[PDB]
Design goal:
Chain J: It comes from Homo sapiens (Human). Chain J: InterPro entries: Ntn_hydrolases_N (IPR029055), Proteasome_alpha (IPR050115), Proteasome_alpha-type (IPR023332), Proteasome_alpha_type_5 (IPR033812), Proteasome_asu_N (IPR000426), Proteasome_sua/b (IPR001353). Chain J: It is found in: Cytoplasm; Nucleus. Chain J: It holds the Pfam family Proteasome_A_N. The structure is cut from a larger assembly and holds ten protein chains of ten kinds. Chain D has a single domain, classed as Aminohydrolase, N-terminal nucleophile (Ntn) domain (Glutamine Phosphoribosylpyrophosphate, subunit 1, domain 1, 4-Layer Sandwich). Helices cover about 35% and strands about 25% of the residues of chain D. Chain D is built from six helices and ten strands. In chain D, the strands form two sheets. Chain D has a five-stranded antiparallel sheet. Chain D is globular, with a radius of gyration of 18 Å. By secondary structure, chain G is an alpha+beta fold. Chain G has a single domain, classed as 4-Layer Sandwich (Glutamine Phosphoribosylpyrophosphate, subunit 1, domain 1). In chain G, the strands form two sheets. Chain G has a five-stranded antiparallel sheet. A five-stranded antiparallel sheet of chain G has the order 4-5-6-7-8. By secondary structure, chain I is mainly alpha-helical. In chain I, helix 2 crosses helix 4. The longest helix of chain I is centred in the last third of the chain and has 17 residues. The termini of chain I are far apart. The chains are: A mainly alpha, B alpha+beta, C alpha+beta, D alpha+beta, E alpha+beta, F alpha+beta, G alpha+beta, H alpha+beta, I mainly alpha, J alpha+beta. Chains F and J meet through helix 3, strand 7 and helix 4 of F and helix 1 and helix 2 of J.
Chain lengths: ~130, ~90, ~240, ~240, ~240, ~240, ~230, ~240, ~150, ~230
């Protein structure tokens, strides 16, 4: 705290701080003189979920139409890692069925399978005070 | 258990196991988190990845309802001898 | 945040004078993950909420948070779906009883003032929990004009020029506060536009004519109607072109 | 922690755990699917036999709450039967008051409020069953509503309740249910049930089938054995 | 635990422990076997005596002229249920002048037993019933659980060590339909023998048999009247 | 309505609420009753005698009827309810059977009323024990004692309160046919029993008597002081 | 419903739930009542957290009869229940006596309702304190009904947030010769010390009672009184 | 239900009713209330705790209540609970002992069944012969010649136990005794008339007179006592 | 799970967990080490630990069903002299709400009984009565039932 | 406590029912013997003080002229059961003009047991089980009959049943002395022999009760002179 904002002024030194529990942080650390900006990396919205899916499902080999919108509707509450898991689990269903490609059905199971796994997760909505 | 394993046969008596054998819980704060880890380590030694050895443990408590379900499981506490009031 | 006894399990006061159970009912409104926005204009009131249909298996014609309490009064429900229907059914019964007992349509202000009275009992008696839902009635009064009233689980109620309930209530409130500061008596088209924009800007969705529901009441026709997808598309097209 | 011992206490995150725990009983029961086709609704329940001693027809998860409305249940069977009687008495009262068969939308909205009434007080516990109500009429048309232990009633085109609901839903989505009829759906409903059944897990299931549509003159009846066996043969062949 | 003290508390695993605890009262009761044929439905019960100077507790109770049950569990709760089914069977005769169908009776006690498993401060009926009856639909064997869930069974055994009888019933379930009355009762006695320890044997003192058939009223047989049935079966290996 | 099981069985088989009520009796003033030949006697220790207290209002010896009176030990408020309930039933029995209530009947009703409060929802047990004395229609003296459980027994002489055990031990040794030969000797037995726990003397002794075909008579302090002198005088000649 | 009292005596002889109810009162909006020679004034801070709220939709100062008024400090929903009960109680008095209910009599009836919820089963005490003003027998009346159910006759009092200093402010600023208009001036001054920000005609609510009866001052009227402050 | 039930009407392991005892502690922190019986009248002196100078004086008395034409009562404890009991007391009204017994049956009822908390009020009753009564939340009632309830009741009773000459007291002697007892019980060394509340009950012309002494009359009693106390200082 | 407190907390253990959160998925993607995690109470675990990048698959281990329980007892009776009349199907029906450890303990306890009575072969009755010991039901005189 | 009255143990036991069964072991020992010549009922008064009148301790109660009951456990609780038995009897006589069977009388009293509840119960409903075991003995169409009742509502006919503190010891002695074909005098004598061995005090004609219900004859309370005749032997 004395180095971010103390007697000696910090010049040309920038600090990026990351945490999923900003509620537990000290008020002095969260003070605007030290952490001026509190950038909220929130859970992806409908468009944000769609963008992340194409990022991770890009290198996936697939034939047939892939309805990314259908995945997005069932992806509500997912994070970026969950959408990558949907791509991973979709291929896992292809490998399980001895396929060299992933179809929309495989994606349909994967997004549903990950959705069941989200029931084990506790409260995530934590914000700085 | 490391010192118990340095012997061919051993007996460990845990009198009043309920002091550390209480069931795990989450009360928001760190309620009994450290003591639960002690029970978790004891549970790990009784039945974990590594074989326990030739140790036969003996636990005594007057409050068995408070014990953790994993500690009250066969492989850690196989026999549950009840000392009921004499007839 | 001190506690003493069952102050977190039943509706009894905390040592600092707080009803945690009632407060927890407010966090229950956000469990549905939907945001509703209501805006009142010079001669109309508009309620706008997002409708989420996760799968094509669901009949989208049934997933509606817009309810016609009576002909001249409509509401949008936010929170638990099961608790929302009970409040709507309770509100319909009180509206019908008011019509039978008093001979005229129940005013919008008195409709939740009754509903807030029912929900206040839940916050005082300990054998039942508060209803985790938020009610926003909109209707055209005979003299006062368009009216908007939010009706919270705590039994609080107040009139609003433009209000919002749900996960993004405070994000949408700041947006509506800015628009109201400009002091424009919006027409019917503008109220729908600012209500759709408020939900669009806060959520950043760029709504399609299947993802929100719009319910309007106007002075010319003091009846509550749900905007169809064709009607809702006209406003979205107008939003895009400007 | 004490936040989950009653239905009248809210969790600090604003969730009623007793209602959520009651939903887990539904997720422990066998799956029951219902698909709304163009001209009716077909109900298919995977009904296991826990032992060979039970007769063919025991633990009927398919009920008849009215002459035109069916009921497929999942979860605790006793509360399913109690809710069936509540739905039965709701339809009887509606006819005895208004003079016609109760609409499915009103029946679903009426039984759900009874289900919801048990999720508010510590004096009672939430119902441990989720059920699907299906009906067909010439005017209203085919309808299919699912009511969960919380009391949420939503119309459906294809719904599944039970432990294999998530896998069954994926198989329902493949179907073009809005165009095919009951006679074609009863084959697919059997196919979905056979696909989602786990033979290495709990096995020896009996396929319970029921439907209501224009082919039954808007009357909910158990699928005839001759058609039911034909649907069973198609489902078994689909598994190769 | 904290989820097992009341019947209105759902466990995190979607279970009601008080209901399951009441279900164990049936398992504490003595074994009873109920099986049916194309024309008969019999109940075979193994009465228990607290001491050799006390009589064996009655286990088969007459409900109606065509419906008979065998209890398993709390005797006081059985009387409360048996009186209820006796009244409902009587009420059908007073109104419809017809025997109450067995299927239509177990539904009533399945709903009567469901109410206490859902309201605060009430307890499930800690008794398990094996209902045998004959009606227009033929012989029936219904098993009633404290969970208010009933099963329409071809042949069921409930009580202590009843699963040994379930094995025998399952093995010989194929020959239950076409066998006559004498063979049907012998099957239940043989099944009830599996629940006994090795040194014990079926005697007239601890065996009760109840029979309901197409043209036969429900009659309960006792020590003197069990002899025509007990002597037929051979000694077990 | 409050419908809660206050009195429940302990795992050992005891009704703790009944036992706790009996503990409140052991905290009350010592009440001693002696059944003589032609007279029945009730002696109650007056605990602490404040000079500013109206002795008329605080009275542990009350008359249920013209031939039955009782002295209690325990919670004063609880006893008055029992006395009024018994007094009402004394008149109900008289209007029905046209005969004054027997000492058994009013003791049975009070005991049954006590037991009802140990097995009813929402009611705690009465925390008082009663020493019921009186004469039957045939003139037989009768003394009865009830306890919060609801059990009643007939006693030749008994004590309830804080010093019950010591007085009953004293009464076990001195209650003889000779000691109840005359009314004065019966009176002196109660005072001797009461003086074993009463420390100051006759000042903390409230004695009331009932003779056959006569109403309950409360002894004035001078009469009690007169009796105490006799025991003190008789103590010297026995030394 | 629960048939057992949720308010019980602490080992140190306190109804603890009542004290916590009073804590809710202390966290409410300030309310100031001054009994002048020719009338009574009731003032409170009706400040909303946004401009979206309709100020005139919900009023903190509500009339009970033609001559009795209420103003509170505590929980808003609880005050509406007590408003209806008091209005119901006033009608019951009016029906049987055909005379408007005396201010003192109404306070006893309202405080009895508040006391009941302290002893009744399965309920919590009201988290408000009611300032009751009225005019009977040509004499002004001002009363305070605490959550406990005890009613005090106040010549000048303040409740809600910062009420301890508001009571002290009234100690050095009130005399029995004050007139109705000066009481309004003093009531606004009492709010101003506890007030944060600026007091407009919409963020405060004033109601007065005189021989003409009780009426809540319109926003136009309050603006004129506020101008004298500055 | 069982979880949230405090079980007010149950027995402690020592045979005590905890709610009754805890309510009796509330009276100990309440205002001091005195009662003295004389040959020509009964008085009821109560300490006034509503002594804020902004508190309006409208009611006839704060803690002194008239039950009927022949009776007056004073309360100590929860004032709200006192209003319930006083309102009931007038409904029952009749002899003085009969009225106290009837209310004490109501108070005892809350300590035995119902599950509600007891009425934390101790009352002193005066009525017409002349008699003074004290009641407790347990419902235990008893007549007194001189007794006190509230703050420093034990200290006041000790003073009465020493200075109350039984039988040979008129109102003036009893009234002077009340001020002197109140002087030591109060923390105030002056005990002005605004901190006390005296009501005297007497029989006149065949009618019972219940009058609350005016502030002027009380100041004479305070002035007389302080001079009488100062007279004893002349001895030392 | 991490928590916000003002007086005390287990900040050291949460620091160790936060380090593990890095190792599973942090600044340096470690995609060459496979991680297996086992716990009894997934409700206690931190949501950041149950993330879909750190623990991609969360496999639920259910109570063994009737078919599994018979398999489990057969597995642990391989090195055991068991008579060819034991009905593991019947034993599985008698072991409702039994986990694998209790099913294994049934075989272990049944060997105790065979040694207790001196038998050199395990019978079905030994398994049947060994279930009672593993069931650990409290002693009761419930002979007045039925 | 947290537990209600109608709560089931993990072993299927009703907690309050089992706890009331433990209350019988604290009561006095009662012995009942069924004999072809009649049913004998014996019980110990358990005199705790010489001043207490033994006549006041009524532990054998006339239910009717043809049926009697012996009580053990909580004597105060048995009064409600006895009163209902004496009311249910004379109600059968009122409606059917005949004496109720001993089995039916025990069955009616048994239904009173387990009729206890905390919530959803009548205001007059009981809160706890009756911690008393009853020994009904009388003569009917089936001849002499002895029935034993327990706080669980389970009633069963017993040839010779001993209840109370020494139930375990007396029952073992009863089995060693009971045969089906004996006389009532032997049954009375054997009950007194067993009681004398189990009593804390010394057996005499004032600290015990003996009751016989013979066919033809009515329920009879043994007097001191009658008691002294059989005690003088053993």
């Amino acid at each position: 705290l004395n180095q971010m904002d103390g007697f000696d002024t910090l010049h040309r030194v920038k600090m990026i701080m990351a945490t999923n529990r900003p509620d537990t942080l000290d008020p002095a650390l969260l003070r605007p003189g030290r952490l001026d900006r509190k950038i909220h990396i929130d859970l992806p919205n409908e468009q944000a979920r769609l963008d992340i899916l194409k990022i991770h499902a890009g290198p996936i080999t697939k034939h047939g139409e892939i309805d990314y919108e259908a995945i997005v509707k069932l992806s509500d509450g997912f994070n970026g890692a969950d959408l990558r898991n949907v791509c991973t689990e979709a291929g896992m269903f292809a490998i399980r069925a001895d396929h060299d490609f992933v179809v929309q059905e495989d994606f349909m199971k994967a997004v549903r399978k990950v959705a069941d796994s989200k029931k084990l997760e506790s409260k995530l909505d934590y914000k700085p005070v | 258990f490391e010192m118990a394993r340095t012997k061919k046969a051993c007996l460990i008596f845990f009198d009043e196991i309920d002091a550390i054998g209480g069931a795990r819980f989450d009360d928001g704060a760190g309620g009994d988190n450290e003591v639960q880890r002690t029970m978790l380590e004891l549970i790990n030694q009784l039945d974990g990845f590594d074989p326990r050895g030739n140790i036969k443990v003996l636990m005594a408590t007057n409050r068995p309802d408070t014990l953790d379900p994993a500690l009250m499981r066969p492989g850690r506490l196989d026999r549950k001898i009840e000392f009921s009031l004499p007839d | 945040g001190s506690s003493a006894g069952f102050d977190r399990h039943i509706t009894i006061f905390s040592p600092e004078g707080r009803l945690y159970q009632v407060e927890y009912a407010f966090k229950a409104i956000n469990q549905g993950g939907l945001t509703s926005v209501a805006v009142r204009g010079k001669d109309c009131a508009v309620i706008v909420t997002q409708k989420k249909v996760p799968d094509k298996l669901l009949d989208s014609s049934t997933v509606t948070h817009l309810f016609k309490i009576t002909e001249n009064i409509g509401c949008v429900m936010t929170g638990m779906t099961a608790d929302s229907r009970s409040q709507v059914q309770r509100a319909r019964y009180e509206a019908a009883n008011w019509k039978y007992k008093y001979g005229y349509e129940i005013p919008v202000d008195m409709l939740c003032k009754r509903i807030a009275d029912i929900s206040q009992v839940y916050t005082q008696n300990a054998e039942m929990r508060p209803l985790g839902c938020c009610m926003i009635l909109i209707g055209i009064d005979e003299e006062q004009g368009p009216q908007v009233y939010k009706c919270d689980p705590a039994g609080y109620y107040c009139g609003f020029k433009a209000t919002a309930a749900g996960v993004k209530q405070t994000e949408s409130t700041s947006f509506l506060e800015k628009k109201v500061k400009k002091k424009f008596d919006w027409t019917f088209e503008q109220t729908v536009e600012t209500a759709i924009t408020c939900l669009s800007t806060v959520l950043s969705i760029d709504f399609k004519p299947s993802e929100i529901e719009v319910g309007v009441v106007t002075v010319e026709n003091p009846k509550f109607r749900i905007l169809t997808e064709a009607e809702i598309d006209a406003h979205l097209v107008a939003l895009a072109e400007r | 922690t004490g936040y989950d011992l009653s239905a009248s206490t809210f969790s600090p995150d604003g969730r009623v755990f007793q209602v959520e725990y009651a939903m887990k009983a539904v997720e422990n029961s066998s799956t029951a699917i219902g698909i709304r086709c163009k001209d009716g609704v077909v109900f298919g329940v995977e009904k296991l036999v826990l032992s060979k001693l039970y007769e063919e027809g025991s633990n009927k998860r398919l009920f008849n709450v009215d002459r035109h409305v069916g009921m497929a249940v999942a979860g605790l069977l006793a509360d399913a039967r109690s809710l069936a009687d509540i739905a039965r008495e709701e339809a009887s009262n509606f006819r005895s008051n208004f003079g016609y068969n109760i609409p499915l939308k009103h029946l679903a909205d009426r039984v759900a409020m009874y289900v919801h009434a048990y999720t508010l007080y510590s004096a009672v516990r939430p119902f441990g069953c989720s059920f699907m109500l299906g009906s067909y009429s010439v005017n209203d048309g085919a309808q299919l509503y699912m009511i969960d232990p919380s009391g949420v009633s939503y119309g459906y085109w294809g719904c599944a309740i039970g432990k294999a609901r998530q896998a069954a839903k994926t198989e329902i989505e493949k179907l073009q249910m809005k165009e095919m009829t009951c006679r074609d759906i009863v084959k697919e409903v059997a196919k979905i049930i056979y696909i989602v059944h786990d033979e290495v897990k709990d096995k020896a299931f009996e396929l319970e089938l029921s439907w209501v549509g224009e082919l039954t003159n808007g009357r909910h009846e158990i699928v005839p054995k001759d058609i039911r066996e034909e649907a069973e043969k198609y489902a078994k062949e689909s598994l190769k | 635990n904290q989820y097992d003290n009341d019947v209105t508390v759902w466990s995190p695993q979607g279970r009601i422990h008080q209901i399951e605890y009441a279900m164990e009262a049936v398992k504490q009761g003595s074994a009873t076997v109920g099986l049916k044929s194309k024309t008969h439905a019999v109940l075979v019960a193994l009465k228990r005596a607290q001491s050799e100077l006390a009589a064996h507790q009655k286990k088969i109770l007459h409900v109606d002229n065509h419906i008979g049950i065998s209890i398993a569990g709390l005797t006081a709760d059985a009387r409360l249920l048996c009186n209820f089914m006796r009244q409902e069977c009587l009420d059908s005769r007073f109104v419809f002048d017809r025997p109450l169908p067995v299927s239509r009776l177990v539904s009533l006690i399945g709903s009567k037993t469901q109410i206490p498993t859902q309201r605060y401060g009430r307890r499930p009926y800690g008794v398990g019933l094996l209902i045998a009856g004959y009606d227009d639909m033929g012989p029936h064997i219904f098993q009633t659980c404290p969970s208010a869930n009933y099963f329409d069974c071809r042949a069921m055994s409930i009580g202590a060590r009843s699963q040994s009888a379930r094995t025998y019933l399952e093995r010989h379930m194929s020959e239950f339909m076409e066998c006559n009355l004498n063979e049907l009762v012998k099957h239940g006695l043989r099944a009830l023998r599996e629940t006994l320890p090795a040194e014990q044997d079926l005697t007239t003192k601890n065996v009760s048999i109840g029979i309901v058939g197409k043209d036969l009223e429900f009659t309960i047989y006792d020590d003197d009247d069990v002899s025509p049935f007990l002597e037929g079966l051979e000694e077990r290996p | 309505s409050y419908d809660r099981a206050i009195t429940v069985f302990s795992p050992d088989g005891h009704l703790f609420q009944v036992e706790y009520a009996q503990e409140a009796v052991k905290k009350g003033s010592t009440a001693v009753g002696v059944r003589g030949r032609d007279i029945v006697v009730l002696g109650v220790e007056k605990k602490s005698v404040a000079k500013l207290q109206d002795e008329r209002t605080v009275r542990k010896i009350c008359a249920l009827d013209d031939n039955v009176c009782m002295a209690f030990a325990g919670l004063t408020a609880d006893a008055r309810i029992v006395i009024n309930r018994a007094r009402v039933e004394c008149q109900s029995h008289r209007l029905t059977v046209e005969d004054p209530v027997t000492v058994e009947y009013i003791t049975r009703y009070i005991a049954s009323l006590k037991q009802r409060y140990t097995q009813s929802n929402g009611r705690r047990p009465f925390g008082i024990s009663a020493l019921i004395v009186g004469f039957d229609f045939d003139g037989t003296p009768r003394l009865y004692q009830t306890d919060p459980s609801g059990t009643y027994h007939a006693w030749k002489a008994n004590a309830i309160g804080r010093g019950a055990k010591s007085v009953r031990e004293f009464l076990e040794k001195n209650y003889t046919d000779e000691a109840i030969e005359t009314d004065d000797l019966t009176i002196k037995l109660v005072i001797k029993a009461l003086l074993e726990v009463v420390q100051s003397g006759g000042k903390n002794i409230e004695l009331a008597v009932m003779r056959r075909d006569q109403s309950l008579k409360i002894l004035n302090p001078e009469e009690i002081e007169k009796y105490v002198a006799e025991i003190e005088k008789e103590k010297e000649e026995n030394e | 419903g629960y048939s057992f009292s949720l308010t019980t005596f602490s080992p140190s002889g306190k109804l603890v739930q009542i004290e916590y109810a009073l804590a809710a009162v202390a966290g409410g909006a300030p309310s100031v009542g001054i009994k002048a020679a020719n009338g009574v004034v009731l003032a409170t801070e009706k400040k909303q957290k946004s401009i979206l709220y309709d100020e005139r939709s919900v009023h903190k100062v509500e009339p009970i009869t033609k001559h009795i008024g209420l103003v509170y400090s505590g929980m808003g929903p609880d005050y509406r229940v007590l408003v209806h009960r008091a209005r119901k109680l006033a009608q019951q008095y009016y029906l049987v006596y055909q005379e408007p209910i005396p201010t003192a009599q109404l306070v006893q009836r309202v405080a009895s309702v508040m006391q009941e919820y302290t002893q009744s089963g399965g309920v919590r005490p009201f988290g408000v304190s009611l300032l009751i003003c009225g005019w009977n027998e040509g004499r002004p009346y001002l009363f305070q009904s605490d959550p406990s159910g005890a009613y005090f006759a106040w010549k000048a009092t303040a409740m809600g947030k910062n009420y301890v200093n508001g009571k002290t402010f009234l100690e050095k600023r009130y005399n029995e010769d004050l007139e109705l208009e000066d009481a309004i001036h003093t009531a606004i001054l009492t709010l101003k010390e506890s007030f944060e920000g600026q007091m407009t005609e919409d963020n405060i609510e004033v109601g007065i009672c005189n021989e003409a009866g009780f009426r809540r001052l319109t926003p136009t009227e309050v603006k004129d009184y506020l101008a004298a402050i500055a | 239900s069982r979880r949230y039930d405090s079980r007010t009407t149950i027995f402690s392991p020592e045979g005590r009713l905890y709610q009754v005892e805890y309510a009796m502690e509330a009276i100990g922190h309440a205002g001091t209330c005195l009662g003295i019986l004389a040959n020509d009248g009964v008085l009821l002196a109560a300490e006034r705790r509503n002594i804020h100078k902004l508190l309006d004086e409208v009611f006839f008395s704060e803690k002194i209540y008239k039950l009927n034409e022949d009776m007056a009562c004073s309360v100590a404890g929860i004032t709200s609970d006192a209003n319930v009991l006083t309102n009931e007391l007038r409904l029952i009204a009749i002899p003085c002992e009969q009225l106290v017994t009837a209310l004490c049956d109501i108070k005892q009822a809350y300590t035995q069944f119902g599950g509600k908390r007891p009425f934390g009020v101790s009352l002193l009753y005066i009525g017409w012969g002349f008699q003074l009564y004290q009641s407790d939340p347990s419902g235990n009632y008893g007549g007194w010649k001189a007794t006190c309830i509230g703050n420093n009741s034990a200290a006041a009773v000790s003073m009465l136990k020493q200075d109350y000459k039984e039988g040979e007291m008129t109102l003036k002697s009893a009234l002077a005794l009340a001020i002197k007892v109140l002087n030591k019980t109060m923390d105030v060394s002056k005990l002005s008339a605004e901190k006390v509340e005296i009501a005297t009950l007497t029989r006149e012309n065949g009618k019972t007179v219940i009058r609350v002494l005016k502030q002027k009359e009380v100041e004479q009693l305070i002035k007389k006592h302080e001079e009488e106390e100062a007279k004893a200082e002349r001895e030392k | 799970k991490r928590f916000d407190s003002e007086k005390a907390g287990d900040r050291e253990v949460q620091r160790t967990m936060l380090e593990l959160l890095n190792q599973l998925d942090g600044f340096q993607p470690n995609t060459q080490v496979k991680v297996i995690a086992a716990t009894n109470r997934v409700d206690i675990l931190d949501p950041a630990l149950l993330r879909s990048g750190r623990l991609d698959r969360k496999i639920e281990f259910p109570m063994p069903n009737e078919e599994a329980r018979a398999r489990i007892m057969q597995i642990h009776s391989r090195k055991m002299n068991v008579s060819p009349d034991v009905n593991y199907e019947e034993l599985a029906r008698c072991t409702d709400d039994f986990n694998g450890a209790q099913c294994k303990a049934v075989c272990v306890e049944a060997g105790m009984i065979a040694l207790r009575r001196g038998a050199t072969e395990l019978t079905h009755e030994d398994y049947m009565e060994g279930i009672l010991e593993v069931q650990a039901k409290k002693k009761a005189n419930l002979q007045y039932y039925a | 406590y947290d537990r209600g009255v109608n709560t089931f143990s993990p072993e299927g036991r009703l907690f309050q029912v089992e706890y009331a069964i433990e209350a019988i072991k604290l009561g006095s020992t009662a012995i009942g013997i069924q004999t072809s010549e009649g049913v004998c009922l014996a019980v110990e008064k358990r005199i705790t003080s010489p001043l207490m009148e033994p006549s006041s301790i009524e532990k054998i109660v006339e239910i009717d002229a043809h049926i009697g009951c012996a009580m053990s456990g909580l004597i105060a609780d048995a009064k409600t059961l006895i009163d209902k038995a004496r009311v249910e009897t004379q109600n059968h006589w009122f409606t059917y003009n005949e004496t109720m069977t001993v089995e039916s009388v025990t069955q009616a009293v048994s239904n009173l047991a387990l009729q206890f509840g905390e919530e959803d119960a009548d205001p007059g409903a009981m809160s706890r089980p009756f911690g008393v075991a009853l020994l009904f003995g009388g003569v009917d169409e089936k001849g002499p009959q002895l029935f034993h009742m327990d706080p669980s509502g389970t009633f069963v006919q017993c040839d010779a049943r001993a209840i109370g503190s020494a139930s375990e010891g007396a029952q073992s002695s009863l089995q060693e002395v009971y045969h089906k074909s004996m006389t009532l005098k032997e049954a009375i004598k054997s009950s007194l022999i067993i009681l004398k061995q189990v009593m804390e005090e010394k057996l005499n004609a004032t600290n015990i009760e003996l009751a016989t219900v013979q066919p033809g004859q009515n329920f009879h309370m043994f007097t001191k002179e009658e008691l002294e005749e059989v005690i003088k032997d053993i």
